[PDB]
């Protein structure tokens, strides 16, 4: 199959307590709220609230298996 096809089909399993939503993050600036806002921006991981590449060929395991 295709790598994404293998990735997408794999790791998908449903149990009790299993999260439906896959949250995605980004490393970017943030401006802290006042507890008006503080006058500085620092970098941290933020979660995309709205849910918004190079994919190569698979390998052969026996060539890289041991002897």
């Amino acid at each position: 199959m295709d790598p994404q096809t293998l990735i997408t089909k794999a790791n998908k399993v449903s149990y009790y307590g299993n999260p439906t939503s896959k949250e995605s993050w980004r490393y970017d600036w943030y401006q802290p709220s006042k507890v008006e806002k503080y006058p500085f921006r620092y970098k941290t991981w933020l979660r995309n609230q709205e849910d918004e590449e190079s994919c190569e060929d698979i390998l052969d395991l026996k060539e890289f298996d041991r002897r």
Partner: protein, 395 residues
Amino acid sequence: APFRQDSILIIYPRSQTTLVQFGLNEETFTVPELEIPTQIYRTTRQDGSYTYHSTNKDNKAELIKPIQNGEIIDISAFTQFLRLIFVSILSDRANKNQDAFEAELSNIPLLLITHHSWSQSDLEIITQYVFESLEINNLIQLPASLAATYSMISLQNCCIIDVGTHHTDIIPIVDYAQLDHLVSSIPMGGQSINDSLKKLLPQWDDDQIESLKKSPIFEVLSDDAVKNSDLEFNTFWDEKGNEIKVGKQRFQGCNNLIKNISNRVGLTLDNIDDINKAKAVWENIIIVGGTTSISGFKEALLGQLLKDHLIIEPEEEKSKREEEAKSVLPVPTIEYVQCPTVIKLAKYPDYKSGYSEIIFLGAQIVSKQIFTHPKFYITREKYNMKGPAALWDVQ
């Protein structure tokens, strides 16, 4: 939530080749099945974007070795390389078993053996990649040193000397914890022997020196030493098949390496703040690596450690005292306030001696430890809430 041990995936990226294993047998001790070179081919394009391939087919190609001296020089190539491996195991089982996605590939926890040099930034990215791009719901990022000591039962304090080809890592451990401020690395390794031998054997070929280094006649001998150590000249056969006659230089070349290691281990352990903790570390020394497999290497290094760093009464002073004691017809031992009193190698209880072996052994015990009572590793529940910042949850 549900897990079957055949699904667990362990990856141990190294500077040259990565060891991977999929599943644990539960019958016996786990051993790395697959050994893969650590590299990826990257064809740059006009877009300014990058494309990575398994093979270049002689095209723009190049080659990216994502790991240099154990560190990560290219994070992007490393993740794609990681992705390359993960996808590869998925297809192999997919082709072998039709229902695989519903059973063995249903949930695949990933256990990644990390390196002391990896930055927080790198680790955070790797976490993001595993959960987002690889769509894996469980991840374990385990330092190799802690993994290595995990195999050693009830080993609280120790110092791992890990000798690599181009570098050697010094990893002091105290209270089951890696002290990062004291971890160091020396640009010395197995290759330093080749560089050392090339000085003393200029007429030799770089191919012939390596062939000498791995030959059975190459060993490092103690001061105490038809047997090989006794005769001046001995011989070995090259990979070409040709005989090569070599003199005293077969016993040389490792001195420069062993001294620099010893010297570095000295300062490292001297900066351990609690002597009682420090004493324990000196009593447990772990010498591991490819180079260490050379005959007499572990003994030579250990000996060199005792030579310079051991605290004991100088034989010159002790001799005069025993001589002066008589002075009779027809001696108390000196006590020192410093560390160590004794230096010895880590005992392997209940065990085979390699680094790759013990780490994987440790990785297995950890899996038993984590999955039984999880409450280290990240779960999708945390990654959704905290994100790659979930990597750090402590205190």
